[PDB]
Amino acid sequence: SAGVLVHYDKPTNGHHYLLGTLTQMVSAPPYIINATDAMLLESCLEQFSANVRARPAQPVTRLDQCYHLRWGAQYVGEDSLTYRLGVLSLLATNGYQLARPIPRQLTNRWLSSFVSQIMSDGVNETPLWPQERYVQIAYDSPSVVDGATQYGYVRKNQLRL
Amino acid sequence: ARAAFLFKTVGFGGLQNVPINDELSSHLLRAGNSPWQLTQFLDWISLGRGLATSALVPTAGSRYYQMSCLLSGTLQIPFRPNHRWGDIRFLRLVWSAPTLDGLVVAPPQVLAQPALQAQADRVYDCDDYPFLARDPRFKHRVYQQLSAVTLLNLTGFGPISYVRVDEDMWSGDVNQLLMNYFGHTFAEIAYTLCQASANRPWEYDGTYARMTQIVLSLFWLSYVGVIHQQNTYRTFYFQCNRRGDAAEVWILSCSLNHSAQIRPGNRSLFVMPTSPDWNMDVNLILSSTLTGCLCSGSQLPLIDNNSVPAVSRNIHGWTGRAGNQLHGFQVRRMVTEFCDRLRRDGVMTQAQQNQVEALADQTQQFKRDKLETWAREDDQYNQAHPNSTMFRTKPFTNAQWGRGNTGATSAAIAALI
Amino acid sequence: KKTAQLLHADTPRLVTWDAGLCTSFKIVPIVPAQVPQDVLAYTFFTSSYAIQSPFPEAAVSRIVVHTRWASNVDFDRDSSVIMAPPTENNIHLFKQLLNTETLSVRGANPLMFRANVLHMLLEFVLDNLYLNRHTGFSQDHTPFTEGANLRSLPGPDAEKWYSIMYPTRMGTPNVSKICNFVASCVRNRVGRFDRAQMMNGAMSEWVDVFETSDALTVSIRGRWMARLARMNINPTEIEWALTECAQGYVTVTSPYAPSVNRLMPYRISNAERQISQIIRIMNIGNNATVIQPVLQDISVLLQRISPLQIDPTIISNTMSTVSESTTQTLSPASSILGKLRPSNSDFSSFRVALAGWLYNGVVTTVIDDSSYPKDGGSVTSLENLWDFFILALALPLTTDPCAPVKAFMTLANMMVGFETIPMDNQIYTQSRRASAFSTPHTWPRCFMNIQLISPIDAPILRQWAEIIHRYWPNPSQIRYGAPNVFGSANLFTPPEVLLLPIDHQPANVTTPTLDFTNELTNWRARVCELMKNLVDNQRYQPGWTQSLVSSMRGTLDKLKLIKSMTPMYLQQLAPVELAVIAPMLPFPPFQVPYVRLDRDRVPTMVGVTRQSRDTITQPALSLSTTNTTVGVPLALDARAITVALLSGKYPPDLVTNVWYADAIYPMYADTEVFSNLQRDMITCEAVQTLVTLVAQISETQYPVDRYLDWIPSLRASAATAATFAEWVNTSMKTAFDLSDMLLEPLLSGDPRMTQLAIQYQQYNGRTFNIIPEMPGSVIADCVQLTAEVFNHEYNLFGIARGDIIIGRVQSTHLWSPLAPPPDLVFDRDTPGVHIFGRDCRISFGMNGAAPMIRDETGLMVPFEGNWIFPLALWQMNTRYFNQQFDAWIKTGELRIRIEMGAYPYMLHYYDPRQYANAWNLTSAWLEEITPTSIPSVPFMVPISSDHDISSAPAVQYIISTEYNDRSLFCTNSSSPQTIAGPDKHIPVERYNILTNPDAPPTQIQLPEVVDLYNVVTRYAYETPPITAVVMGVP
Amino acid sequence: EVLLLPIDHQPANVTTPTLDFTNELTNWRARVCELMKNLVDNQRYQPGWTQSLVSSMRGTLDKLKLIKSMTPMYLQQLAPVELAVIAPMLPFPPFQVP
Amino acid sequence: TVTSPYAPSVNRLMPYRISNAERQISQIIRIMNIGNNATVIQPVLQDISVLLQRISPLQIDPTIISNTMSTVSESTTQTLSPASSILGKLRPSNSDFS
């Protein structure tokens, strides 16, 4: 009923799944967050920071840091926090960058504002759509997981940015 | 294990549409509105004790083909790229739910609007449709039956069966379960295995998977004539008293006279009948059905592209560059093969062979006449009613009546031992 | 009645055996043979030498329907269809349904015919659900066969059965019709010709024989056997399923050898259990008196199985640990031992709280309101303090999804006059009673986010909210059951999974010693610390001595450290017990997901649907509107639960494996689940049969073929559909010997748009649906096959098809009125006919001018010609039409064609050598027509002669439009030939298996022609009880 | 030649479905039942109810909503016909304002 | 349909044709006759309602309600329940439908 998460790039001790418990995070002043939403949010922020700070000669521990949702999509609505965080995770993995600085030590109020922006009214313009089946990469995206990694990533010649 | 869930639909027989119409569809759904007919099929053939016959379903192969046609026609609505289910109709029929439980008659507003126009020889993937991808148990439960449909619709001949010989399959639990089936016919075992498969999908190397593979190997080895009462496979064999008749019965038996020496290792092949006689033979259809119900939990070796027609090539998980070939036989010659192998082994005389061949010749005469007459009636109907254009049985040509590769498949199955 | 049906339901009778003949048609001799004649010497006939003959020896023989006239059965379905010969009146068969307003005993309402036939066909199927039994054989000691094996029938007078059952054994000394036919047959197809002899010195498993029978009931019993065979299971699978069910605390064995074939039909499909569960849930809705005994039964069983027992003194002694001085007026320990108030008889209330965990989808357990403070809570009083403590311990055990807010508000009501927090409105204020907060809408907004509570104004409530939000118990799941035989009935949760509101952890040790790492103790620790905070207050103390503040914190540490085995037991032993018990329950578990504090996910509605609305044929669209809500709350006692939580005790020496092995063993010898499965199958069969039969008389949303639309039927309404469905239900219950409810939940409504589905919805608007798949049914398919056959063989059932012509015809010719020459018939397309409808008006004649009646074209015609009438026009103007037209039909040149569609008939025979006139019969038939009923049509038919006879006049008045003489067998069966009258020989097509030598033995000719000599399979399977083959270790 | 009615009329047809919301009276019953479901749904107009009763009210309202009565059908189709048949024969002919 | 045979004649007399004004005048007289006396109008309504009860095929069976609910109280201890409350107020046991 809660989602199931996975890393495809370099999981810590081998292939594994993460299942979230039904606790919540109330530290954010105006918003309540389930555990699975909190994990997706922290990882996507990490990958955005790593994208912006990237340098061609500077290696990184992992090329992808965002989580992927593998099970339990049918329990999540399109107005919800989990679905939008999944879309944002896919965007960050593709190489997208937020148009606003991310501080090197996050605070509660900043996270509150960020979540409020995520749940603000509007629609999604980018042509990237979530699928629990696999992780889809654009034709011309500057990622390099596909050559080094064999499982979980598929590159589409017709999905281009 | 299996990673891809592709299937193939039926192809037009020169007609302008899927060869099913409203009349046949209402005949199928008279006692249950579910398109997944595989249980109701089992209630119609009546354990294979006689020659089943209906006005609209003259044979068993007719019903199998008509179930294939209905699924192929109707599953093309939810598999359009927009993935909508309740918006249009196929031959007055609409889907009840997003989860494809059954079929109902279209509401008046949809009846006013036109119907979907299906296409021949389509190949679809189960993961494309979101409601299938979301629920794995549902996907496997329906993919068993889709695998059976693909096995019928892969080539132009009859159904395809899979035979495997391996010593490490046997174990303690397999022995314990196999002892219970002593004295039962092949059809009864097939029924029970199909119901058990319906309730719970099987592990990769579970007891039931190895059990059903062993059962198929026993049936085919007895059918060819390698194994009998005086030459057993760990004391187990299949027995027919009335070889050659229109509705044969095979009984699982145990005997302590001998045990055939078996070479170590793993071997397998794909076999199929080519003559139209398969339309009236229920054991072969049930063997193909068992292979289909197995295919959901396991992965079979790929079939070569050179043994299949052009449109059925390079299917992701079914056909491949250099896979195994198909071994095709036709029924009447295989009876001579059976009698010859028995007579050479020394357990059968010449007069008994004479009687068996005479009975088989009579049976083949009757079957050929009936099938040709039904073909003529279908042609006449298609000419009279251009708005229906249906087929009651899978089409065939005269050249399929001759023998071909029968000796080769017989030799290969004997060489499996 | 409903709760008894819930606890246990009647087991249907499936397996029944027939030892007679598999036939339901009978040949009878309508007219006697003319043996002592004066052209042939009596020595010619084989009747004078007393040879028993396979067929009646008579001048006329005819086929009639008589279900099970040759059978010998061990159980009686008691639904026979018995038909009298056509020389008798058979109207009573057609006037059994909706003919309650018919006055005459001799008439029936035509518009009801299609209703009466369909029910009749159902009966025909229900009487033939049997299995053919293998009796025994003997070898022929005579040359009449080539050493054939002949079968023996139990019972008296088998010497006639031997002559009936083997037609081809008779000698042929004669050139009669019977001798010619039986000489034309083949001689090697009599008796047995297959045998499955598997073990020496035992019964052969089955045989295949040639014998007298009909193909229709052979098909029916073949389908029945196929269904029962798919239902079969073997002892090894039963052993594995029982071993899985007990989680390893029970071992049973199975034999290992070649054994005889058994029949134990118990495996069904998952959809059948789904449908049964939905039917039961709509059967139970909104009634607490129906479900309360279920929980009582489960609680008693939980006490029977479990090692934990409740010892109240474990609290009392600790309470006597400290002493308070005899110089004070209030004492904490006295308050505890007064408000807790144990008597050990309330253990049920504890167990009932656990059984409720299995049913939170239909039942909700809530704390009784009287447990709360009578006038509200004040922190200054000690009773109110400990009442808060009792409630704060007791609430987590319930399945009420609003327990956390109830606890928070129970404390907030205590602080009124001490601290304040903002509320949402003026109606639900801080002084509102906490029980009023019973829905997700009443949850206050300060509870969601902690910024709305001041840390400086209400620090205690800030801390309590934090404690609740981060330290409430977590939900969990366990595995149970054995779906390889029992399947599962889980609707919303996945099969094999049982959900709990409390986290579960298995034990590593079989000899446990006290441990406090369990979640329940951790909660109590939070509670006691929070109590200490507000007791230490200097604002609370003024009325209390400082030693009293100290003694309060002391007693808070006594209960913090009580030796309580209840918490560890729930964390480790109780889930195992629930998983063991659940598969044996007669009402299987039904749950919706537990949510901890996620208000966007609390379930707010559970609804089943049973019919559809207007112009909506798809269930997914109509479920959201047509559903009906289900559920009741249940009241529990807080003090009992709290005492049970504080005072749990294990036996002094416990080894868990031995205890559970000894406890669980007896309960697995009971086999009620194997009966429940057969009950489920029968329920699903009945539902599908109802749908298929109802679809015939009225329009519905399912696709079904329609064979009987040539039989007249009324404009059915909701009342007629309900009345038909009640008859269907009665027949279904009588056949399978059921005395309790069946299909009756469906009948409290309009049965013309039935459907079954369920849904539940969340607080945020998300809804989840279940739509079970229709599994198919064999009774409905057999009924439709009976309809297909009836479409061609209606004559054997007593029904004639078409219309009739009334008109005088006089000649000496000897043709039959059931097959008249084509020149006596006319139709609508005939040149010169007049066609009448509604607006016929008769104008009288004057001064010798002929009277006239109005055509449809507007022309007015006199009373002579060829007229076409529909039946209703004569019905609605009976007396007037008789008095106007009968003279002109009798003597004049008027001939009238009456359109009837389907009708019964009666036969009258006569001697052709004498004068015969049929006016009396036809006048009676015409005059007995009423607006709502008609009698059987009378026909006059000549008797056939085998030698010369002279001719005589005859007058006929009724003829049929088409061939309606299919129920005739041979005429003059003993003479060489028939010279005069209708001539018929024995029908070759019925005996095609014998007359055509190149046909396979298993051929059938349905639905066109019913054969009367077939190949039948007879079985000898064993049907033992499960206890006989599966044996447990004592 | 006119007789006035406060209800609509339709041609007589004995086979009309029972749950049909094209009939004004059945539709009116359905709308009232749904409004009461809205009224009781959130329990904000019923303080002082100690234990929850929303499921029981909803169940009773659903049972009353889908009931199989023929009276709205009869009033839509056959009652106007009966009134029109009786009307010309009455000793006191009708007197109606619109 | 109604029919009435006759033979041709001109000495037949069946005086029954009048105008609309005469009927309207008589109706106005009959309206003034009531004079707010209810005893004048009570019989008319009562008899017309009984005639309608005779002719109409619709019939009223209160049991349809009781089966739809299907609730029974063990005792007075079942203090508060919606289904029993509505059944008690509707009173199916009374059969006066005037």
Numbering used by the authors:
A (entry chain A): 217 to 377
B (entry chain Q): 2 to 418
C (entry chain H): 242 to 1275
D (entry chain I): 737 to 834
E (entry chain I): 492 to 589
Copied sentences from the primary study:
MRV is a prototypical member of the Reoviridae family of segmented double-stranded RNA (dsRNA) viruses, which is further divided into two subfamilies based on the presence or absence of turrets on the inner capsids: turreted (Spinareovirinae, including MRV) and nonturreted (Sedoreovirinae, including bluetongue virus (BTV) and the life-threatening rotavirus). MRV capsids are composed of two concentric protein layers, encapsulating 10 dsRNA segments. The outer layer of MRV consists of the protection protein σ3, membrane penetration protein μ1, and spike protein σ1. The inner layer consists of proteins λ1, σ2, and turret protein λ223.
Inside the particle, reconstructions of virion and core particles clearly show that the layered RNA genome and densities of TEC (at red arrows) are underneath the inner shell, indicating that genome replication from ssRNA to dsRNA has been completed in the core. All genome-filled core particles have the turret attached at the fivefold axis. Thus, RNA genome may facilitate turret attachment. Five λ2 subunits form a pentameric turret at each of the fivefold axes, serving as the mRNA exit channel. The λ2 pentameric turret changes conformation during virus assembly: in the core, the turret is open, with a central channel 75 Å in diameter; in the virion, it closes, sealing off the channel. In the open conformation, the Ig-like domains of λ2 straighten, forming the channel for mRNA capping and export. Unlike the core observed in this study with an open turret, the crystal structure of the MRV core, which was obtained on samples generated from chymotrypsin-digested virions, shows the turret in the same closed conformation as that in the virion. Studies have shown that assembled core particles in the condensates are active in mRNA transcription, but this activity is inhibited after outer layer proteins μ1/σ3 and σ1 are incorporated to form virion particles. Our structural data align with these functional findings: in the core, the open conformation of the turret maximally facilitates mRNA export efficiency, while in the virion, the closed conformation of the turret suppresses transcription, leading to a virion in the quiescent state. Due to the limited number of particles, we were unable to obtain an asymmetric reconstruction of the core with TEC resolved inside.
